[PDB]
Design an enzyme around this catalytic site. Sequence first.
Site, short mmCIF file in Angstrom:
data_model
loop_
_atom_site.label_atom_id
_atom_site.label_comp_id
_atom_site.label_asym_id
_atom_site.label_seq_id
_atom_site.Cartn_x
_atom_site.Cartn_y
_atom_site.Cartn_z
N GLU A 117 38.47 30.94 33.05
CA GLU A 117 39.59 30.33 33.83
C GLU A 117 39.12 28.95 34.24
O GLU A 117 37.95 28.78 34.59
CB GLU A 117 39.96 31.18 35.01
CG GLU A 117 41.29 30.75 35.63
CD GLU A 117 41.78 31.55 36.81
OE1 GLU A 117 41.25 32.65 37.08
OE2 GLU A 117 42.82 31.14 37.43
N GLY A 257 33.47 31.44 43.50
CA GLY A 257 33.01 32.67 44.18
C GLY A 257 32.93 33.84 43.24
O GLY A 257 31.94 34.59 43.24
N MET A 259 35.36 36.01 39.71
CA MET A 259 36.39 35.90 38.70
C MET A 259 36.92 37.28 38.27
O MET A 259 36.10 38.15 37.94
CB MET A 259 35.85 35.11 37.50
CG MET A 259 36.81 35.04 36.29
SD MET A 259 38.30 34.11 36.72
CE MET A 259 39.52 34.99 35.79
N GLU A 260 38.26 37.44 38.27
CA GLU A 260 38.90 38.71 38.08
C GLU A 260 39.04 39.19 36.62
O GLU A 260 40.00 39.84 36.27
CB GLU A 260 40.27 38.68 38.74
CG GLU A 260 41.27 37.71 38.04
CD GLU A 260 41.35 36.29 38.66
OE1 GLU A 260 40.35 35.77 39.25
OE2 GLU A 260 42.45 35.63 38.46
N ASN A 261 38.09 38.85 35.74
CA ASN A 261 38.25 39.26 34.33
C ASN A 261 38.53 40.75 34.25
O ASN A 261 37.95 41.54 34.98
CB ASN A 261 37.01 38.94 33.49
CG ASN A 261 36.43 37.56 33.79
OD1 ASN A 261 37.02 36.52 33.46
ND2 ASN A 261 35.25 37.55 34.42
N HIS A 293 39.53 40.57 46.98
CA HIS A 293 40.31 39.53 46.30
C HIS A 293 40.31 39.78 44.81
O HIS A 293 41.36 39.80 44.19
CB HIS A 293 39.70 38.13 46.62
CG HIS A 293 40.51 37.00 46.07
ND1 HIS A 293 41.48 36.35 46.80
CD2 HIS A 293 40.48 36.42 44.86
CE1 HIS A 293 42.06 35.46 46.02
NE2 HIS A 293 41.46 35.48 44.84
N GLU A 294 39.14 39.92 44.20
CA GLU A 294 39.10 40.10 42.70
C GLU A 294 39.74 41.38 42.26
O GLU A 294 40.45 41.42 41.26
CB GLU A 294 37.66 40.01 42.17
CG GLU A 294 36.86 38.77 42.65
CD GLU A 294 37.59 37.44 42.43
OE1 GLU A 294 38.37 37.33 41.46
OE2 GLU A 294 37.42 36.57 43.31
N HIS A 297 43.57 41.10 42.32
CA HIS A 297 44.03 40.36 41.15
C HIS A 297 44.39 41.30 39.99
O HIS A 297 45.11 40.90 39.07
CB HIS A 297 43.01 39.37 40.65
CG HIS A 297 43.12 37.99 41.22
ND1 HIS A 297 44.30 37.26 41.23
CD2 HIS A 297 42.16 37.16 41.69
CE1 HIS A 297 44.04 36.03 41.65
NE2 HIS A 297 42.78 35.98 41.99
N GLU A 316 47.32 33.18 43.11
CA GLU A 316 46.37 32.87 44.15
C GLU A 316 46.91 32.98 45.58
O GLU A 316 46.25 33.57 46.43
CB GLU A 316 45.64 31.55 43.91
CG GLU A 316 44.82 31.48 42.57
CD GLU A 316 43.82 32.60 42.45
OE1 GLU A 316 43.50 33.27 43.46
OE2 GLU A 316 43.38 32.85 41.32
N1 LIG Z 1 40.59 33.25 39.68
C1 LIG Z 1 39.20 32.68 39.85
C2 LIG Z 1 38.69 32.74 41.31
C3 LIG Z 1 39.59 33.62 42.11
O1 LIG Z 1 39.50 34.84 42.14
O2 LIG Z 1 40.70 33.21 42.69
C4 LIG Z 1 39.20 31.21 39.35
C5 LIG Z 1 37.87 30.61 38.97
C6 LIG Z 1 36.60 31.19 39.08
N2 LIG Z 1 35.69 30.30 38.61
C7 LIG Z 1 36.32 29.13 38.24
C8 LIG Z 1 35.82 27.91 37.72
C9 LIG Z 1 36.71 26.87 37.39
C10 LIG Z 1 38.09 27.06 37.56
C11 LIG Z 1 38.59 28.28 38.10
C12 LIG Z 1 37.69 29.30 38.47
ZN LIG Z 2 42.01 34.47 43.18
#
Ligand SMILES: N[C@H](CC(=O)O)Cc1c[nH]c2ccccc12
Ligand SMILES: [Zn+2]
Length: 866
Positions: A117, A257, A259-261, A293-294, A297, A316
């Site tokens: 992302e 922080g 990432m919701e993969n 949060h993750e 998502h 978001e």
């Molecule tokens: N949805 C995630 C974070 C979240 O949960 O909202 C977004 C994110 C994570 N790392 C990144 C690096 C560059 C751009 C975007 C991100």
């Molecule tokens: Zn998020």
Amino acid sequence: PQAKYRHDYRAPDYQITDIDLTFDLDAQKTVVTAVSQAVRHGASDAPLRLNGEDLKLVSVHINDEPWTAWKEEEGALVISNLPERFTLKIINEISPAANTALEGLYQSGDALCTQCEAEGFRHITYYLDRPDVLARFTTKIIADKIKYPFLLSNGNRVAQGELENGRHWVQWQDPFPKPCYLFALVAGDFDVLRDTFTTRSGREVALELYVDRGNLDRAPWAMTSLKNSMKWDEERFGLEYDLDIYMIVAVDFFNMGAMENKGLNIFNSKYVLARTDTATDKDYLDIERVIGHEYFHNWTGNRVTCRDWFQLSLKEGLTVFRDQEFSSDLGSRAVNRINNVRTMRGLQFAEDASPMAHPIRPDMVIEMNNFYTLTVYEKGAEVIRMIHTLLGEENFQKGMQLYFERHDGSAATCDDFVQAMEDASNVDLSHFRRWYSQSGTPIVTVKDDYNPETEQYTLTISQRTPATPDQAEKQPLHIPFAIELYDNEGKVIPLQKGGHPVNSVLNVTQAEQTFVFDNVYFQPVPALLCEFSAPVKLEYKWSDQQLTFLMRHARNDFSRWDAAQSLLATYIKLNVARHQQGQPLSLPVHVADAFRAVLLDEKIDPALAAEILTLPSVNEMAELFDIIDPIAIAEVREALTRTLATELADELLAIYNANYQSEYRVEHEDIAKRTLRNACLRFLAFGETHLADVLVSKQFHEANNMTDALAALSAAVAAQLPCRDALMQEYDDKWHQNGLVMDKWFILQATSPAANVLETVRGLLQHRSFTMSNPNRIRSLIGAFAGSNPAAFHAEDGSGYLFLVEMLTDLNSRNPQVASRLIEPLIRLKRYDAKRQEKMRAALEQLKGLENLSGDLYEKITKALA
Ligand SMILES: N[C@H](CC(=O)O)Cc1c[nH]c2ccccc12
Ligand SMILES: [Zn+2]
Ligand code: NA
Ligand code: NA
Ligand code: NA
Ligand code: NA
Ligand code: NA
Ligand code: NA
Ligand code: NA
């Protein structure tokens, strides 16, 4: 670099339905094979334009025919003359070890991991890297078994094999269609904490937390929090997890922080690892909120995703709202609301007045990584919260159910979401939609009248949003404006008009309107914008005694805190003006007395007391002024702290001692007492010096947990106490091998009020625990200096600016995303005096001239200089 515009959105000429990936993994040279099943929706002469950045193309086949009708251009492989349905095969090479920007496939220590992302998947292979193309993924990973014994991707593990030469392979299949930004791959060696969660309907989910070897002792709180999140989303929203496995991987090198993969979240280790000697109460609560949060998502983001990146707030804002609700339901709702309001007023309002101002749904973006903002997230959540305020919980849940019913399995827009809420609730949100399109903070002005002859209270409310740098035209918004009216005994006066109850959420929809209330049997004291019912500045001419009255009587804890903030604001503004004339602090005694009453009130929740006793930050204080004087603000904060410490010294010490706790628990009543105790200590540190030094040194040494040890250390730094250097050195000697623990110490160094702070910060660039390759270290030292020490950053000689230019000259080439986060304090130049503007503009002009200026910085610099 080129701007993209929301109004230029068009459905794609091609879709991909299914992609089968093979990775022959190696840190130096990874070979990617991607076989995509594609469909042409547009005209035969529209070629397939695949995004790709920094890829070495090996081969292109269409239905297994080597394809001659293509060309490569800047950022794209453009393929012509295709049939309506076809199999695309691409082979290409990438180099994870060379990836310093941490976008795509890169190295985190000895692990390989991804971040896709927003637009990172095009750094892995040629693709339709846009979130309205959803496909079913299968991922085969082939690697050296000794270096990469775990090979993870989204979904279920469906196949596995062993090869010659010490290599092995695993294949993963994720049955849910997804956009590519949700793709993940992890390869490495880890310890794994394994558990299970059984959903409400009886599905048993395997939970696996992957941490670096030796860190299993730091994983159970995150595991507990994941379970808590799962249970809460069932109870509050009726949502269950949809796979049989949930994987989290904690990595030390990560730009944001987490990432919701899908089924394979990748987390900055900052928001996973906790032990009582390494993590504070705040770290535990942050882990809880980010894990949540993750998790959230999974529905708000994954099961329904975004049509295009302009719609980012669709996921978001709503997911922040969900994480706030989670935290608030499990913890103190008042403390949560207070802290989120602090963030809005002190950090987001400043963004909304800056050259980077944008609506929660942006109209124009150059680099999409620049739009993961306070506005999109925090203001986005306030917007969702306004919907909640307007609809009530039941209608809001109906809107959620309709949203998922319509859009599950697809990519949606902010407007689709609003429509679901309107259609399910029957509340008209046509005007409300303007909160998505309009940037800037509205200013709501309230005048009032009491008519003792008719027992009527009249409120005349007006609104205006000033022009912002991005928008010359502004209109009135639909502002939910919650009120409560108090009689002279502190009781709530029923709101009514012409013999009928009136809802206390007023609909302020005009530039100016009047509301009349009847049967108001005493001249009221109003609580206005209760629970911060809309994200607005309030102009009302409070007396100090209306405010101390609310501090004592208001029904919601939030209003008690907020009244105290308004009480302080007046005297902060006075005292900054006094500072600029060389005068000492002046404060009427009835202010000190209001705070003494809070400290000695036996019925008040210690959590609430603690927040009332936490002065506004320098950022929050800055928002009170048209032109910021950061030195005067810092000095006034200190002087107010010293004055209260002197005036309240006996009371502060009594409360400090009464809130002593021998056991450490991560439990809301214990946290609340400890937060109060430490707020007392912080004032005490600014009192009589001998007693300060003794209390602080002793707390540091006796602490049985990091919350109390760091509160002491932090107080020693803030007040420059004699013990400071010895305590700081002890910390370093004990914790230097632990980067996350050292981040706390870097922050204290960067935010220190000492006269030689810049010189110490520059020196710490060589510290054994610092490295420019790690975003956390960078943020904790450099970012904390520039962002959180505005008095030093804004040194009149320009030295803070020059330092930041130097750091950013490196970071522009190394990791532009981190560079762009760090430049933010410089783009606020218009809020400062002419001489500081001059110097900040010259810094920005210097950066503008970098060779190989990143798009990320270019966007911010050009807006700031315009
Ligand atoms: N949805 C995630 C974070 C979240 O949960 O909202 C977004 C994110 C994570 N790392 C990144 C690096 C560059 C751009 C975007 C991100
Ligand atoms: Zn998020
Ligand atoms: Na085919
Ligand atoms: Na598709
Ligand atoms: Na709660
Ligand atoms: Na917040
Ligand atoms: Na309804
Ligand atoms: Na005031
Ligand atoms: Na601010």
